[PDB]
Design a protein around this ligand. Sequence first.
Ligand code: BCL
Ligand code: BCL
Ligand code: BCL
Ligand code: BCL
Ligand code: BCL
Ligand code: BCL
Ligand code: BCL
Ligand code: HEC
Ligand code: HEC
Ligand SMILES: CCCCCCCCO[C@@H]1[C@@H](O)[C@H](O)[C@@H](CO)O[C@H]1O
Ligand SMILES: CCCCCCCCO[C@@H]1[C@@H](O)[C@H](O)[C@@H](CO)O[C@H]1O
Ligand SMILES: [Ca+2]
Ligand SMILES: [Mn+2]
Lengths: 38, 39, 39, 38, 39, 38, 38, 39, 39, 39, 39, 50, 50, 50, 306, 10, 32, 42, 107, 47, 286
Amino acid sequence: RPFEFRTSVVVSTLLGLVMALLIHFVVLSSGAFNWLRA
Amino acid sequence: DRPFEFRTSVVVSTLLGLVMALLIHFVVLSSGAFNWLRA
Amino acid sequence: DRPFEFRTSVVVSTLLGLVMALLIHFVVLSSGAFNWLRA
Amino acid sequence: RPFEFRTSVVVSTLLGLVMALLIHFVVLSSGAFNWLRA
Amino acid sequence: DRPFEFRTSVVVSTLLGLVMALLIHFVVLSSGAFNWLRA
Amino acid sequence: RPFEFRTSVVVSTLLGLVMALLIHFVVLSSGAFNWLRA
Amino acid sequence: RPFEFRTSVVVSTLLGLVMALLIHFVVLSSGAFNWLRA
Amino acid sequence: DRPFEFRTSVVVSTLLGLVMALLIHFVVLSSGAFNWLRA
Amino acid sequence: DRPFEFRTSVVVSTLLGLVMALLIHFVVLSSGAFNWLRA
Amino acid sequence: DRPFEFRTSVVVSTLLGLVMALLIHFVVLSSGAFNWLRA
Amino acid sequence: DRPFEFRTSVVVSTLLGLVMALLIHFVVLSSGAFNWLRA
Amino acid sequence: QNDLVPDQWKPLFNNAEWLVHDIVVKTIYGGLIIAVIAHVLCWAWTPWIR
Amino acid sequence: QNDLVPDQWKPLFNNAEWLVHDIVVKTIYGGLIIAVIAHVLCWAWTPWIR
Amino acid sequence: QNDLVPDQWKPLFNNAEWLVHDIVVKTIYGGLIIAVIAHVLCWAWTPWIR
Amino acid sequence: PIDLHDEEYRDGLEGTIAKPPGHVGWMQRLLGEGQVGPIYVGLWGVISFITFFASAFIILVDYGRQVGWNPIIYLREFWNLAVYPPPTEYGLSWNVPWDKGGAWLAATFFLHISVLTWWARLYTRAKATGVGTQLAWGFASALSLYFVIYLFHPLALGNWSAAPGHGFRAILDWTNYVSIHWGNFYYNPFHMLSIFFLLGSTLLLAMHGATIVATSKWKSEMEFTEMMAEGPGTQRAQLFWRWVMGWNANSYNIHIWAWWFAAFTAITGAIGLFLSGTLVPDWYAWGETAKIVAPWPNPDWAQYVF
Amino acid sequence: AAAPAGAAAA
Amino acid sequence: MNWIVATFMLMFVLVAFLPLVVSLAYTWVTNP
Amino acid sequence: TNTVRGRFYIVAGIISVVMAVASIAIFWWIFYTITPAPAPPL
Amino acid sequence: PASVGGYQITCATCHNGKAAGLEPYPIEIMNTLPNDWRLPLELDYPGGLVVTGRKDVSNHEVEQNQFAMYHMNVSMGQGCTFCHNARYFPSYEIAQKNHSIIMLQMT
Amino acid sequence: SPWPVWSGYALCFVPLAAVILGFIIAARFTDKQATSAYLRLDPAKAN
Amino acid sequence: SAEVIPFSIIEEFYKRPGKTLAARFFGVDPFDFWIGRFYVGLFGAISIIGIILGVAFYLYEGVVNEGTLNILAMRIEPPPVSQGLNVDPAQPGFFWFLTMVAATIAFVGWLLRQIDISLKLDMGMEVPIAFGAVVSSWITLQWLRPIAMGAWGHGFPLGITHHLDWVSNIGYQYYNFFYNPFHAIGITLLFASTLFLHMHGSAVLSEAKRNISDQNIHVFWRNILGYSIGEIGIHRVAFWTGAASVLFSNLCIFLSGTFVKDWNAFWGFWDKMPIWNGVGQGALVA
Ligand code: BCL
Ligand code: BCL
Ligand code: BCL
Ligand code: BCL
Ligand code: BCL
Ligand code: BCL
Ligand code: BCL
Ligand code: HEC
Ligand code: HEC
Ligand SMILES: CCCCCCCCO[C@@H]1[C@@H](O)[C@H](O)[C@@H](CO)O[C@H]1O
Ligand SMILES: CCCCCCCCO[C@@H]1[C@@H](O)[C@H](O)[C@@H](CO)O[C@H]1O
Ligand SMILES: [Ca+2]
Ligand SMILES: [Mn+2]
């Protein structure tokens, strides 16, 4: 069974998840938007 | 033959959902925007 | 055949419930919101 | 034969020696009795 | 065949006696309660 | 017997690509063009 | 079999390319010419 | 049977000459004895 | 057949001579006794 | 069956002589007792 | 059947003597007791 | 089994892999649309380039 | 094989190695002449022995 | 093979090895002459034993 | 006259437990073997077990006493709790309070007994089968450094506080403190020898593993039958290392290299540590008198300041 | 007779 | 700190892990 | 080269490299766009 | 010396905008230390925290030395190499070590 | 004196020379043992 | 089946021309021959050039430019950090740079040469992987970290005793280095590697010249620990552990000047988690 397709989709999903988490934390810790403020 | 087994997809989705729920709860609790368990 | 075994699901559910109960009890005790066990 | 006599003898003898040594160490550290004092 | 071996018991007894002698000598001589090898 | 025009084409193509990458990197990271910051 | 022409061509091309890169790097880092300066 | 091969001797001689030229040029350049490639 | 080969002697002699020449040149240059390469 | 081969004797003697010559030259040079290579 | 070989005796004696001689020479050199190679 | 998969990519995909690939591309398109809407709403809330 | 190699060097050289050897010796002669000229010019510029 | 070598050195040399030996010994003699000249010139410049 | 089946499936004290054996699948796929058990228990394996758990019990109960019998603080502070040897005001005396050094002394004694009986177990089980006693002497070389660290160096220095505490963070602290106390350990030459042998051991392990896995199509890893007649895989490994380095080894003496490179590490370490406090109280000053320290008159210290 | 380990077995 | 060069260098340090991971995956796949 | 496998391998490699560099680029563009500059000392 | 800057001690030093309730040893700076350790000011300086090569000293004293040294480099915002050449800690080749001797005497 | 102390020779240079010489000798004997004639499978048949 | 072969037949059987990387790129290897026992090729000439030049530059920087004949008193040092990532032939650190560059070439050449030989004997690629791990260690220490920091003066000095002063000063600048988690993982893997090497050597030596079967060692290793690994798995574990030891240590030293400044502060989060913060009293708080 070829290993190319499963590897590609797994690495794509991991990249997307990591990038989304990183961007969300960067935006949260900047204070530009109101979002979760005391 | 199949590209993905159903068992692996179920396990991965369950683990990801649990981890994300815990992460969001801790971030929101630590932010201080809501009262929650004060005093 | 069967993707999952009943025994594995039972074990995982029991372990997850026990860990969750202990974690929530510890968080509530350490928060200081309820009187509970005070000197 | 489910139970072996030799195992009982070995385990009981070793446990007795360990307990005797531990009690002697504890009583020596306590300092309550004169014993090996200055 | 034989439930107990004499050679094993001899070896164990000799080792135990040597260890006990060394331990007791060290414990007794480092206490300072006896006048042994004083400058 | 083992020589062919495909070998020369492939070698020259790869060499040109590598040299283009190297020259871009050298020119951009210099006192002039200052990493395009301007 | 020995002193085949293709090997000599390959060796000459590689040596010329390496020497060109080396001399360009040395002359650029010497700082003697007003080339790619800020 | 000849003790050496001619091709290997040519390769070794060429390598030695190149290494020697590079070493001497780099040693002379940084010594500052000649007014060559000075900023 | 024979205890020693001519080729090994040639190779060892060449290597030793090259190393010795380089080392002596470096030492004599470092000593400072000669006005050899000075700015 | 000879105890020793001539080739090993030659190699050992040659290496020992070269190492001794280098060591004695280094020691004599690093003493400062002779006006040799002083500036 | 001989207990020892003559070759082993010769090699061990030679190595031991050489090491001993070098050590004694270098110990005496750095003591300062004799004039010797004194600047 | 190589059916319903075009011959161009037959040396790469089966039919089950073809169905999974179709699901993946549909998910990608839906996510892209939702992301565009989200960015428009966030810009309407607070612009980040001024 | 060796038919235009001189009789003295038959056990050492081949028919093509002789030609390559001649090329090499001429290269070395030319390089030596150029090196001598370069050293003389550099000395006329700045002597390195004083 | 072992026929141009003198009868004394037959158990150690071949024809080709004998020729290469001769080349090497002539090269060594020339190098020694040049080394002697270089040392004499260096001494005339600056003696290293004082 | 050795019956392997009887040696593995006997009952009693001189017998095995964990029968019938088990099977782990991922170990079978990754490592090639998946059977777990049976495991022999004898006289020397029951004296090690009980003494090890006596010492462990003492250590963990003292941890709980320090924390205050609070399970949550116990979990929080587990990796920085320790039981320490008696302070320097006492010498090698055993008349020390329990919370100031008595527990350490008891636990260390029991650990000594456990390691000695484990050595005995290795020796006797090697003789019970048909194999040689080479693991036992390797463990003895390893135990030399252990006994210098915990018994002999404190004896020659005259206090128990020269010995490590019992904890996760306490071993790193002992390493730091002992290097700081006696000058600089980088200028200890037997420390240099130990590092030579440790890094060489890692080099050799990686090399041997890689070259045996690389030629495993021809069954080169069956090193028992290769020491009787060598096949294509061993020949390829020999040619590889001859064409790379200029010399190679056998399917026999490579493991000799392995044994001795691993053994020299502990022996040189024991010698260096023992000499560290008793003969040379300062290794940087010694290295300055021995001409192995570089001058460094004008450092560029801007690298080392934020 | 001669073997890899250095042992000469019959 | 540039923080853009440092991230590329970190990515190189991480991609240095790849051959060992491929070795483990090859061993798992080829031994069913 | 002639098969689809080699073309796919080449395209996958180039896509992965460009996606990695572009991900880093967009991350740092967003970061420097929204993150305020630190305040100078008193 | 004049190379430090010539700054003066005033009221805002030691106070930082508070009248009472000053905390010399906050809980934020006790990260790797026991939360009762205090600076050993009953000793004499130089010589109070010297451990190198001493045979009347053991690991207890080295630990007490290390607590103070980590307090120092948390208070400076620096690493150990601000006052030391780490190849020999007894060395006095960095001027900040003399500055620190003066400041230990002052405190 | 430009000379090290005697313990400098005893603790540093003698162990260094011993390590280098022992490595050379062990390598020589290992290679001598490995490249000798003993029982091997025939490369022509076995491949 | 098996007979006495004199090892000349063994070597003559396996020598073939042209299965290397240069033979696959250019169609022919320009240096496809043997000198003595060694195989020369492309990447064998490059490596030897790098080796000779690196040795010559190192010795010139040590003997000249420092005036010392003591090999243990040399400091072959990089430029100061005030110079940045600039190279200048008229400044002190220049020769260090040359040496460094030459060494890189040599090391990289060595790696590629191994691949060539692995292709000549139809082997796997395990030795190049295991060696590339430590080549990446060198590249991380001397190339990636100084570029991320911003100066060539962040690389290590190349003296025999003086490169350890760099280790000491770097380790105490980021105190406490023992508290670095990747450092602890690397030390654990080193100790485990040495233990595994001793165990494998003992195991194979203990069964060598004996009239036993191959199953005695399995029974031995199963009576003592309860598990025997096998013959392919001992050597696989050796390979993997040896590589991972340095792979994990690359991160520990890269993350020191970048992203971190203090390894005692790194753990400040641990006691502040909601599960157990605010549960003790006295010196048992936090
Ligand atoms: C103050 C110092 C002086 C100086 C004083 C001297 C003195 C004194 C001598 C030299 C000699 C030499 N000097 Mg000078 N030299 C100076 C500065 C320089 C500078 C420079 C850029 O500054 C250079 C490039 C040189 C270059 C040289 C070389 C041409 C020569 C070393 C020959 C050699 O390498 O033998 C080694 C070469 C080999 C090939 C190794 C083999 C030799 C062994 C010992 C014998 C085996 C031969 C072999 C078997 C034959 C087989 C054939 C071969 C394979 C070809 N010098 C300064 C100005 N120099 C030496 C000389 O003249 O030699 C002829 C010499 O005695
Ligand atoms: C190295 C670069 C190229 C190459 C570049 C050239 C160039 C350019 C020329 C040749 C020429 C020739 N080449 Mg070609 N050639 C190469 C590879 C080869 C190989 C091989 C086995 O691979 C072979 C057999 C040859 C063979 C040949 C001959 C057919 C032909 C005549 C040589 C001659 O007359 O001898 C005489 C040999 C000498 C070495 C003359 C000596 C001159 C030396 C080199 C001095 C340096 C030059 C200097 C600046 C001027 C003279 C100095 C003064 C004395 C002061 N080449 C490589 C691949 N070749 C020549 C020709 O006529 O083309 C058809 C020619 O001009
Ligand atoms: C009231 C004060 C606290 C609070 C303190 C706690 C504590 C403390 C606990 C919970 C638990 C729960 N809380 Mg609450 N909880 C709060 C606010 C919330 C909020 C909210 C939006 O504010 C939500 C959504 C929840 C949600 C929840 C659930 C997730 C959970 C109860 C359902 C469950 O799975 O257990 C139901 C259990 C089952 C379905 C399994 C049955 C278990 C049986 C009974 C076995 C028990 C073992 C028995 C003791 C042994 C004896 C056996 C004999 C010897 C035979 N809580 C507030 C902040 N919460 C519990 C939990 O996480 O459990 C997993 C828990 O322990
Ligand atoms: C800012 C200006 C910079 C400068 C920056 C650059 C940059 C950047 C580049 C060059 C390149 C060149 N420069 Mg310039 N260059 C400068 C100063 C100089 C000086 C001088 C004395 O000052 C000289 C002699 C040169 C000379 C050169 C040549 C080496 C080269 C000429 C391009 C070429 O050959 O076509 C090259 C193309 C062909 C021969 C045909 C290629 C075929 C197709 C059309 C190319 C498209 C490919 C593309 C990637 C799409 C791929 C297709 C798909 C994969 C299917 N430059 C100054 C300092 N220079 C280029 C180079 O290195 O190329 C090798 C290059 O990238
Ligand atoms: C508005 C404030 C910020 C900003 C904050 C954010 C935040 C926060 C995020 C982005 C993300 C994105 N931003 Mg933005 N972004 C800004 C400005 C820009 C600029 C610009 C030039 O100004 C550009 C080019 C971008 C570009 C991007 C893309 C890289 C990305 C949107 C693509 C995507 O996610 O769909 C791709 C579609 C898919 C990957 C399909 C997958 C989605 C499916 C639907 C699964 C969703 C998970 C779901 C919750 C699971 C539920 C399961 C069920 C319960 C069973 N941004 C400004 C500066 N940006 C997102 C990102 O990086 O995601 C990868 C992201 O999270
Ligand atoms: C003048 C200032 C310096 C000095 C700087 C240099 C520099 C710089 C160099 C030398 C070199 C030499 N110097 Mg000087 N040298 C000095 C003083 C000395 C002293 C002394 C006692 O004072 C001595 C003995 C020497 C001796 C030497 C020789 C070792 C050498 C020249 C002979 C040679 O190798 O043939 C000359 C070369 C050959 C016969 C090889 C043939 C070359 C052919 C022609 C290839 C040329 C490349 C060409 C461009 C490519 C082919 C064409 C393409 C197809 C287009 N130098 C002073 C201190 N010296 C050179 C060297 O080491 O060469 C190996 C060198 O580069
Ligand atoms: C600031 C730190 C100091 C430093 C201070 C010290 C001190 C102090 C010591 C070392 C020692 C060593 N150092 Mg150091 N070291 C420094 C920097 C380094 C560097 C480096 C790259 O910078 C390296 C590679 C090393 C490497 C080493 C090792 C070579 C050596 C110990 C290895 C060993 O054999 O342990 C293996 C450990 C053992 C063999 C004993 C313990 C295990 C035994 C076998 C018993 C275990 C059984 C157990 C109880 C059973 C229970 C387990 C059950 C299964 C549950 N150090 C710097 C200078 N180092 C030691 C040494 O040997 O000195 C010469 C030593 O004492
Ligand atoms: C560090 C050596 C200090 C300097 C410089 C100054 N003060 Fe201070 N002061 C210091 C301490 C440790 C305390 C005790 C704080 C506490 O929590 O009890 C004080 C206290 C005072 C007070 C009394 C505060 C009160 O009663 O509420 C006053 C009025 C005061 N200090 C004044 C003061 C002035 C005017 C200063 C500048 C000339 C000054 N202090 C400097 C420590 C230090
Ligand atoms: C300046 C604020 C310093 C910092 C940062 C560090 N140290 Fe230090 N150290 C400093 C002084 C002023 C002294 C002298 C103490 C005395 O009483 O005289 C010291 C001393 C040491 C010593 C002992 C020196 C000796 O002669 O034995 C050691 C071992 C030591 N310091 C170590 C050390 C460490 C490990 C540090 C990082 C945590 C560190 N010091 C930082 C000044 C300063
Ligand atoms: C791999 C690290 C330990 C985790 C073990 C449990 C993970 C799932 O382990 C499964 C095994 O249960 C299964 O038997 C084999 C195939 O036989 O495949 C593995 O993936
Ligand atoms: C048998 C093992 C060796 C026994 C050696 C005993 C060393 C005793 O050494 C002790 C010190 O440890 C003790 O502190 C003082 C008290 O004044 O007296 C000494 O005799
Ligand atoms: Ca604390
Ligand atoms: Mn093995």
